[PDB]
Write a protein that binds this ligand. Structure first.
Ligand code: SAH
Length: 263
């Protein structure tokens, strides 16, 4: 039938070890999206290209977990000690590395505009869940739900959090903000993810910020003459037509943080 090519192609690429460590609904999404365009044939070659174009850079947690096992073994007021371990963990990836020397006041700065929330949602969280000594101290004692695309990374975060005896409110899982049903949060975090979304699906960043329900959302961008496209102003120009309001524009470290609210 019509719905059988999708389930067959989705399973045919999810079976291949090249594309098995990613969220199946994403493959289910790009196959259903590329179905009307291209003919029934070439679909696998068209989805494996789209996956390579968009999600090809996030396909293992083995090396990461052993990297984190070293950090928690190399160490002998204790609240400050647990930070210096999370900070060394937050330095493994370039994503959360530059945010160091800013995690000390990042959640304080954000909560000055939004208030201490009851729950934080982190889309494409990556290593950001390990910033829990900073937002729990900032007042956020609710449930933290961070999700990402690569399975192996989420497994590495899950096991490392239990080894740290982190609060059981710090939940990690796998998910895609473009294919999972619309969520609801007291504070949605899109740290260095908005521009990534517009590559995977055209004009999807503003769509997610409009479809998702949140009291407040924080969308961040890097800062880094004139040989790289400036995408911060691109986002500032994207919000002219929407009913989304910029409540505050925080510049911390090498990053710009936009606190967006729809009321
Ligand atoms: N559609 C999507 N839904 C959720 N996470 C996604 C995604 N597309 C990419 N990601 C993830 O988003 C992350 C972008 S890098 C930035 C990670 C983190 N927000 C930080 O600021 O350090 C990667 O982990 C990537 O795999």
């Amino acid at each position: 039938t019509n719905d059988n090519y999708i389930e067959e192609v989705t399973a045919k690429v999810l079976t291949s070890g090249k594309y098995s460590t990613l969220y199946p609904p994403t493959v289910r999404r790009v196959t259903e999206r590329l179905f009307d365009r291209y003919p029934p044939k070439q679909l696998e070659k068209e989805v494996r290209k789209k996956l390579h174009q968009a999600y090809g850079a996030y396909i293992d947690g083995k090396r990461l977990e052993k990297k984190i096992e070293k950090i928690i073994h190399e160490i002998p007021t204790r609240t400050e000690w647990e930070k210096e371990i999370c900070l060394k963990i937050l330095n493994l990836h370039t994503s959360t590395n530059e945010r160091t020397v800013a995690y000390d006041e990042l959640y304080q700065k954000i909560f000055e505009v939004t208030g201490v929330p009851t729950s934080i949602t982190d889309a494409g969280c990556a290593l950001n869940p390990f910033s829990f000594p900073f937002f729990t101290e900032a007042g956020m004692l609710g449930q933290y739900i961070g999700f990402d695309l690569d399975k192996g990374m989420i497994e590495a975060i899950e096991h490392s959090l239990r080894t740290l005896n982190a609060p059981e409110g710090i939940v990690v899982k796998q998910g895609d903000i473009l294919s999972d049903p619309s969520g609801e949060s007291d504070l949605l975090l899109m740290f260095k993810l908005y521009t990534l979304l517009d590559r995977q699906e055209e004009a999807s960043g503003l769509k997610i910020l409009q479809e998702w329900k949140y009291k407040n959302a924080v969308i961040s961008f890097p800062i880094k003459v004139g040989m790289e496209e400036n995408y911060t102003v691109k986002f500032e120009n994207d919000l002219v037509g929407s009913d989304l309001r910029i409540m505050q524009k925080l510049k911390l470290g090498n990053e710009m943080y936009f606190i967006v609210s729809r009321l």
